[PDB]
Amino acid sequence: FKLTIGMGDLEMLSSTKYPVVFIILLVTYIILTFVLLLNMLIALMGEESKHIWKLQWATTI
Amino acid sequence: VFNRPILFDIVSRGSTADLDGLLPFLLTHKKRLTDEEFREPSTGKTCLPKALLNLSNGRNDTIPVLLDIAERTGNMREFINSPFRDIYYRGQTALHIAIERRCKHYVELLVAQGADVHAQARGRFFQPKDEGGYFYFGELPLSLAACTNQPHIVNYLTENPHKKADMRRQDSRGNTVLHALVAIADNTRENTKFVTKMYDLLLLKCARLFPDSNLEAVLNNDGLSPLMMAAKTGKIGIFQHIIRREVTDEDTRHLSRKFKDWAYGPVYSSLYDLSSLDTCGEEASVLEILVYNSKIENRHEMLAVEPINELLRDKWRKFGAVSFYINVVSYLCAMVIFTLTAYYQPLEGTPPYPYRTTVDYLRLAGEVITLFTGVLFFFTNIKDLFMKKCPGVNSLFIDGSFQLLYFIYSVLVIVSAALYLAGIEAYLAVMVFALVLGWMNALYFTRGLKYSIMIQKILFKDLFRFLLVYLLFMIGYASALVSLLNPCVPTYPSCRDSETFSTFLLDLFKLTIGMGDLEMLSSTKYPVVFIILLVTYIILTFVLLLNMLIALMGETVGQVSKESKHIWKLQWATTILDIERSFPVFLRKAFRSGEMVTVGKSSDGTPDRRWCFRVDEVNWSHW
Amino acid sequence: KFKDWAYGPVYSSLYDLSSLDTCGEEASVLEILVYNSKIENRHEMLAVEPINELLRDKWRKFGAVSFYINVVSYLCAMVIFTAYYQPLEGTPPYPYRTTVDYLRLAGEVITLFTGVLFFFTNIKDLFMFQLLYFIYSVLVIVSAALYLAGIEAYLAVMVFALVLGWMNALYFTRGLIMI
Amino acid sequence: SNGRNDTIPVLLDIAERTGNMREFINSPFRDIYYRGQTALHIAIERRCKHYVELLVAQGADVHAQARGRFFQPKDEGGYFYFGELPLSLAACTNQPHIVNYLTENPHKKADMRRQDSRGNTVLHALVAIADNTRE
Ligand SMILES: N#Cc1ccc(O[C@H]2CN(S(=O)(=O)c3ccc(Cl)cn3)C[C@@]2(O)CN)cc1F
């Protein structure tokens, strides 16, 4: 979990018996996590052009 | 007096003046116009085709005199017949030319003596463009008239006292006139207009005469019906017109495939036929060809016709959704068992052969379930080779790449089991990779949804391609950088060893994240180029990551794209048909979509027993 | 634009190629259109009947085969470029006696042949993009000269000689979203 | 068929002779899908002016409720909803002549203010059926 932010220290890769495949399985982990986190943001925080500026503003009145 | 060049020139001139008088010379010398030493040795063509090709102003008086000469010489049966021994015109006859020049007078005149209306144009010029030709129209004079917009010529060839060409006649490939009409039609308005017009004309005319099964039901050498070949070749217009065929004539009612069950209020039902659209095994079906073997450029628009889309929806609602949910839950449970086995697998020393424990027996059960799944996937992938398979499936998004990933998972699980049984310790390393690939393959079951929008917008193939590019780039660049390190004494830090590549890649992975150390910079003996190489590596890594980021942004900003939706429908249909094909014949009969109905009557009062699919519509426009 | 033959649903035509494409003994239109031309409108011209089909026919005849042989040979040469497996210990002029030692040796020879091949190919143009291919080559010859001379500082330039080789290989997807 | 059939006048002619006129034209379909559809509903929905004219000339019934399952909106699991009154059916199916005649007729007229089984009057049915298409 700390690897996602980068706070945690990555000394665990020195313990695996197969660093050649652990590193491959960790790079894909980072890419998958970043894509999966970016998708929900672009799906929710993003969202036709003035539909929101009309409806959400008329709601306040 | 007259030689082959002389006669050919005088007949090409289109003047029946100098030729007159050859009769005594030809008859006293005992010669015939079809003699080997009298026609062209290369082509074999006679003078009559020379006159026909050199036709001017639509008429030439030399041909009547030429046929008169032929009848005096006693060669008329063989005169109007010319199996060109060229490697390009193997069978082109005088009638082929006469129809090819759009002349009604000559197409009447040549058949007025009754020569032939069934010549096979088997030459390499009259072959389909796929097989190295220029124009394919079947191999019949009637097919030639039908394929080049000659309604009057077809009508004359049908009802003529001399000799008529039966519409059921088949070419060298077994294709009939309907098959040729399908084969000529490209998806354009002006073409498809008269193609469909003359298709219906020929179907009605062949239904009137010879009151038996319609000509549309005849099969060529490989069994393809005209509708079947229309779907296979990728022709939207003819296919769509065949589906929505309605004939109001009382005699010819069995030719229709869309009925008018009940018009009740402003909701209008329809009764589409389903004889060739869905069959329970014991027949070829148009849907399986449309999904599996068809011209990919317009495979999506063909699926959006009135019966096919609702047929797929009905199959879904009936059994497809239930079977797909069962499959996905079974797959998820299997890979949950796989994850539990991988995590609880012992790792000490030799592979953990000594189970002798109920917990270890449960672990063995999980392992054997995993091996069963792997061998099942491998056998299903291999068995396809003896079935519908072998497309250009290397990056296709039509389940031709997910099958490749399943093949990889299966073969790698098998090799993991082999290494586990052979004492190789790397069985765990390969097994974890197999587990990861299986969990990513679990995205296969995202085809049952269109949340859903952002799931569909992201494509796994784009992500996997970038992932595989990035991993190879990192490994290849680390291999280059580790070369610069001076050999021996430490191994990874401040030195190089034969094993140091396994640990050096960790430094690059940490440094591209932002947690790396510049310790290896002093390791190399030549830092001046090492720093430049490291900077270039970081710049290219950032370029790759951000290029993938803009790829995602552009792919997800649109929401619904023109093509990103047709592809989803294609995968959904492929999944539905793959589920259907896994059921037995009787089970498919039980789940046969549509309802049995007697659409109408036929000869001898026999009811028309056709499976049909209702598609109701509402329209407040026509009363 | 000739009109050789025509029959209903076919209308053959015969386009001239006197100036559009000239092999050797004349100037050509397509070379000027692609190389020395106004860049802002270089795609409007390529939407004509003969030139597009001319390029497609050239591809179908030989372009696909030549490009697919070239890309595979270049990738194979890059993969062989043995840099990881160069002799760690010993003097840079390491003799070859072991059957496995000489195995790599070959690879070095074929890489040197590729380097001199591109060097001569680019020089033939200079004596009668391509800028990278020139520096793509001369570094290989320099490393080979350093290897045969005895200077230990050959590996540092040898690796960078064909690390740029991968960027050269990147030109195959763009003409030798976007990159 | 063909917009005219001569069997209906003869059937009605036999009907008055049989002495069952008030009961003969009454068909409360007991099917689960047609709970309420009568002769007037069928005649109106077929958009035939002459037959409905003749039918209401004797005034059998003009207040039947089409409470069956078929005559329900798509939400409830039906195919066509127009309310439950024959007047609502005539107004929904674009029959100004049928509504006009059914309102100002000598024999008997239907109450236009009447609510259906769901409380909707004819105007609510007209609003419910009117999708956002120009035609
Ligand atoms: N329920 C269910 C279901 C059945 C078949 C299927 O996939 C078909 C595509 N392939 S597959 O990717 O290799 C593949 C995927 C999943 C599985 Cl369990 C085995 N094989 C071959 C295939 O036609 C099967 N003969 C997908 C499903 F969801």
Numbering used by the authors:
A (entry chain A): 674 to 720, 728 to 741
B (entry chain B): 148 to 597, 602 to 639, 654 to 788
C (entry chain C): 405 to 485, 488 to 534, 549 to 596, 604 to 606
D (entry chain A): 203 to 337
Source paper text:
Transient Receptor Potential Cation Channel Subfamily V Member 4 (TRPV4) is a ubiquitously expressed, nonselective, Ca2+‐permeable cation channel that belongs to the TRP family. TRPV4 is widely expressed across different tissues, such as the skin, vascular tissue, nervous system, lungs, kidneys, and bones, and contributes to diverse functions. Dysfunction of the TRPV4 channel is implicated in various diseases, including skeletal dysplasias; neuromuscular disorders, such as Charcot‐Marie‐Tooth disease; cardiovascular diseases like hypertension; and respiratory disorders, including pulmonary edema, osteoarthritis, and renal disorders.
Another preclinical candidate TRPV4 inhibitor, GSK3527497 (antagonist 1, A1), is a pyrrolidine diol derivative and backup molecule for the clinical lead compound GSK279. In the case of compound A1, the aromatic residues F524 of the transmembrane segment S2, Y553 of S3, Y591, and F592 of S4 play crucial roles in sequestering the antagonist within the pocket through ring–ring stacking interactions. Furthermore, the polar residues N474 of S1, T527 of S2, and D743 of the TRP helix, along with the nonpolar residues I744 of the TRP helix, also contribute to the binding of compound A1. The D743A and Y553A each caused about a 5‐fold decrease in potency. However, the hTRPV4A1 and hTRPV4A2 structures adopt a C2‐symmetric configuration rather than C4 in the hTRPV4GSK279 structures.
